[PDB]
From a paper:
Purine nucleoside phosphorylase (PNP, purine nucleoside orthophosphate ribosyl transferase, EC 2.4.2.1) has a crucial role in the purine salvage pathway. It catalyses the reversible phosphorolytic cleavage of the glycosidic bond of purine (2′-deoxy) nucleosides, generating the corresponding free base and (2′-deoxy) ribose 1-phosphate. E. coli PNP is an excellent molecular machine conducting efficient catalysis of purine nucleosides glycosidic bond cleavage. It is a homohexamer, built as a trimer of dimers, with all its subunits having the active site in the open conformation in the apo enzyme form. Monomers in each dimer mutually donate two amino acids (His4 and Arg43) to complete their active sites.
In the case of orthorhombic structures of the wild-type enzyme with two formycin molecules (WT-6(P/S)-2FA) and of the double mutant complexes with two and four formycin molecules per hexamer bound, (DM-6(P/S)-2FA and DM-6(P/S)-4FA, respectively) all six monomers are crystallographically independent, whereas in the case of hexagonal structures of the wild-type and the mutant with six formycin molecules bound by each hexamer (WT-6(P/S)-6FA and DM-6(P/S)-6FA) two halves of the hexamer are related by the crystallographic two-fold axis. Although the active sites A and F are closed in the structure of DM-6(P/S)-2FA, these sites are not first occupied by FA molecules. The only active sites that are occupied with FA molecules in structure DM-6(P/S)-2FA are open active sites D and C from the closed-open dimer. Occupancy factor for both FA molecules in these active sites is 0.7. Closed active sites A and F and open active sites B and E are filled with water molecules only. The order of filling the active sites has changed with respect to the wild-type enzyme. It is evident that changing the two most important amino acids from the nucleoside binding site, Asp204 and Arg217, completely changed the affinity and probably cooperativity of the subunits (which is reflected in the kinetic properties ). And indeed, in the structure of the DM enzyme, active sites in the closed conformation are not the ones that are occupied first by nucleoside - open sites are those that bind nucleoside in the beginning. In the case of DM, which is not able to protonate the substrate independently of active site conformation, as Asp204 residue is missing in this enzyme form (replaced by Ala), the nucleoside is bound mostly in active sites adopting the open conformation.
Residue numbers in the entry:
A (entry chain A), B (entry chain D), C (entry chain F), D (entry chain B), F (entry chain E): 1 to 237
E (entry chain C): 1 to 205, 219 to 237
The structure:
């Protein structure tokens, strides 16, 4: 019922988990949710709704990049009643002892995109998550015995940057992970009056050049998913 | 293979057609290509390689927005030997005499993205197509009896833009179509030394709810595909 | 000693409360700290150290504006072993449900200053607080039965802004309070590897025109101080 | 008459060739036009009108820099019925394979000027030539046995630039020639609704300070002028 | 009163000298003025009013940085009738032939602040002093046997630069001194229709009393 | 010789007056100078050297706009030993009380050009004149009974600007005259270590004011040139 999602009101839960990869969304639906059904397939951007421990939950890909996820998050918020979005992504690390498969939680997200400047009269908008969602995720990770670090992400427009020196700048200012969406989702959440959080799994070290495979990212980053799902239940109270 | 493409050198032709929707890529392979073989499916971004009138051709989705297509086009160029990219997409018009189903060829692409400023030391980089490819597309269009306009596209970062007034400015400056990728693909081609072209069909008239029927759009879609494919043959001389 | 603080290592606690007004720092030291002693008076920027429920704590003015507070925060971190800074300030509100004397906690801070762009290669640095410090303040306020909202502040360079329309944009994007330092302190904390939090008391409403007096700001905003001090004790565990 | 041109409607053809140097315009009139008459001498900016193979054609200097040529091109468009402007100039190369005496056709023009950002709400306007004019020029060149390169020029505000590093950037993104006017003329054409093209001959290699001799310059200049003139005849059909 | 100044119209003279440090304002008031009276102490930003050779004169700290002094100068101009602001500060020099202990007069002020771009539609506003005040300061200095250098200051937002990349640039383009306020004060003066001047002593690469004498005598020259 | 000046060291005085129009330079030479001889005619940009009251003085056009005058002033300073440049031009007024034929002295020059930001690492360079030259001009004018206004000029890149509202901003900030060169000349002067000044006569009121524009002054164009020349004589003493 929207230009990029062929579904109707009620087809989505009020909370949506969103990886960039629709195939990871499919994996999550098949692995963590009961009674999951596909609710969207437009442009292959798979979305599903099922239950987790009785709680109605949706998962849907948002694609790669700020412009892509801004489209889906906006539509979910304005036309499907979605109140909370939890991005469950991958990222590259720049810090020396942040390692592969570490879970990072983006309370804020830096960016080299122009979208928030366009929204905010060319000033600095601090793209932040909802505090209660951050807190829920931290508490859930603790209950699960999973380490999770909270801090700044950096949302890049260019996965292949011509400016390698910027990575030293990110490292100097404590950036936990380089991904491509958080700052955009946070801008949309503030623009349209909803709540968002980005949780990422470290899938590459930008310095050491260690990296996981495409298959590993699609189907094995499960700590962040358990954290996300349990954090919703805490939020419900 | 690359982190976003599960294939090896040789799997892709040296020319790749790219719609945003990976389902359109599959449709293109099935409809216009002989002996089509799927060569990528990471993140559901379907890619295929086949032949058109004997000529080896590939077709693969690029996803929505500059950051998404920048990843795929970079990787195709540096790791798969691709020499030419032709985006085949949709766009919205802002000019009165540009009608639904019109074909537009982006000789240049304006943008509100920051990617080319990051590349170009914060100055104005004119994101342009390769001239020969533009000319090949014009001649292929003529031989098919299809009228096409050549000029500027505008590649937006925000499909849902909070700056409605900018559309008046685009109209004032002769922008032929509003889409979300061309300026980024043109930046990648310049950065990595390849050739690119974006052709679009007008599928919407901004500030108006006018829409074409399903059969009309497929017919028009097919016309664009034919122009792109025939243009490659002309380029081969 | 440093160019703006005539004290030696050890004279400051490892946690410093910092209002913009040195006379407020004096009030706080005399009212909340036991055995308080003056440790700075350079440029009349009073700083004191004493104990709160057995915990060594310092309080010192940072003056008005990002450039002023950036000086003091840097010096405390590099030369006095300060690990945490809690700014305890005043702000003006734009949101219709925010009232005079409400306490707001700045998980992030937007800004129209150029300093973070200077630090961050002209990109958007999300100026954020330390998460644990935010949670400690939230928990302390709950234990005290004091209400407090958590979200974005906006750190202005011009208290007398010629751009009145920017306040509508701040309001649309949920800015809780307009002040003049948080984004700068958060940038310094990030640069030098320390932790910071800004808590503000609403001293004016930009829409309803209500306003506390200079005398009230100097001495009567005590809820935010109780929250700050108790949050430190929580932080110590 | 207009503030910088003392002529009347009819004194100029609907196509004007424009070198920067008014003395070069005088040379073009004497050399290529029959029955040439001087139609402007305000500020010494000589313009002439005559015929080339029966076709009415004008030639006039535009002076140095974007601000200068923007004045002349605007006035020609709004007050003298001019439809097409062909800048005929020299440029410096930054690419090793681009050689002295090569003819470059600016299908696009990059710039470090702010004039187009001012016009285009501080976004990226792709300053482009008219496609048919570009094609006419290629075809004309081919007929004359010259292979012209088509791509981006860079229009500089500073002939004596303090930023030597920018040339490396220009080279990396494939800029064919450096001059000082094209992006400005293209901006004017778009703003006031006309068509423009810039053709340049490479008279210098910026990195080595290679410089063309006087005799070879006169030869390549003539080639460029023949190309421009014959392109007009092709456009007429 | 204003939110940052607890005084009333008439408490300030129509010219105010402003050092950054309020304790320096107190020193100035005590050393140079007759019948000096404290007229502001909000936030400890001490302001005083007295006479210098029969001429009513005020002196008040403005704090460090563009945002701080922009507040105080605006309120003085719009709410206390002040017509002229003279900043009397210290600066660091980058030029070889600008000496320690030299007096520099900022006819213009560069800055890495965004405040004037906010004011001037993101274009380049040349933050300048009032010409007559510059002339008066030069002439007052001359009469005191001092050659003041007139030129550009640079007003920094970051005393502690993250990379220090601007220093060589300031030197290349002839900046006389580095401080943290002038361009802000000049922007305020332009915005609200008053006149301002920044005078600095080169404190790095009295003297202080000489600078104050130049500022005070330059006012008396202006009154003529 | 230099790329834009066919002359040798010694041909120019160490002070050069520069109008935009080279024909105006000719007029000044013939009207004001003894034993004037032409020293340059490259690109029709006439320059002359003669004496005024025994004092060796040059006069030469600079063309229109920052890029044009930046070329000439740089070449004069670095290759012809020029120490002082005085632009003598016309400007438009935006202030209601500024009269036609009033003389404006640009102690500073605002601009919408990017050249100084290029020089100054994207920060605000205050483009200022030499103080002694300003003072000499004020005294020279006063001696002739002319009260010259001293303040900011605004140097525009676009004579035909799309942003009419900016003239309101100029008026609000007390801009005395609008022209097209001062900020660029002042930038060159600072870059290459020389001294410069722009003096202008008001030739028009920009835009229509509800108010009444005062009246017209009795001051002439010849009066301004006299001021300029006499200011040189004062500076010599
Ligand atoms: N009116 C419009 N505005 C922006 N983008 C598009 C498109 C294209 O469709 C996608 C978004 O729907 C994206 O790839 C964009 O380039 N079609 N019509 C459009
Ligand atoms: N070399 C220098 N750099 C920056 N600021 C200053 C100052 C002034 O001193 C204060 C900072 O110490 C502030 O008001 C600034 O304008 N003196 N010397 C300086």
């Amino acid at each position: 019922a929207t230009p990029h999602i062929n579904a109707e009101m009620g087809d989505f839960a009020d909370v949506v988990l969103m990886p960039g990869d629709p195939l990871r969304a499919k994996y999550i639906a098949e692995t963590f949710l009961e009674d999951a059904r596909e609710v969207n397939n437009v442009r292959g951007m798979l979305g599903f709704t099922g239950t987790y421990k009785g709680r109605k939950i949706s998962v849907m890909g948002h694609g790669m990049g700020i412009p892509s996820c801004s489209i889906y998050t906006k539509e979910l918020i304005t036309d499907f009643g979605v109140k909370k979005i939890i991005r469950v992504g991958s990222c590259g690390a720049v810090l020396p002892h942040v390692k592969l498969r570490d879970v990072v939680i983006g309370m804020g997200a830096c960016t080299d995109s122009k979208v928030n400047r366009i929204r905010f009269k060319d000033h600095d908008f601090a793209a932040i998550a909802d505090f209660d969602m951050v807190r829920n995720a931290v508490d859930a990770a603790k209950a699960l015995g999973i380490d999770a670090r909270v801090g700044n992400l950096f949302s890049a427009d260019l996965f292949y940057s011509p400016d390698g020196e910027m990575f030293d700048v990110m490292e100097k200012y404590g950036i936990l992970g380089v991904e491509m969406e958080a700052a955009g989702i946070y801008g949309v959440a503030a623009e349209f009056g909803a709540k968002a959080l980005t949780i990422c799994t470290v899938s590459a070290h930008i310095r050491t050049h260690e990296q996981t495979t495409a298959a590993e990212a699609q189907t094995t980053f499960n700590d962040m998913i358990k954290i996300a799902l349990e954090s919703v239940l805490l939020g419900d109270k």
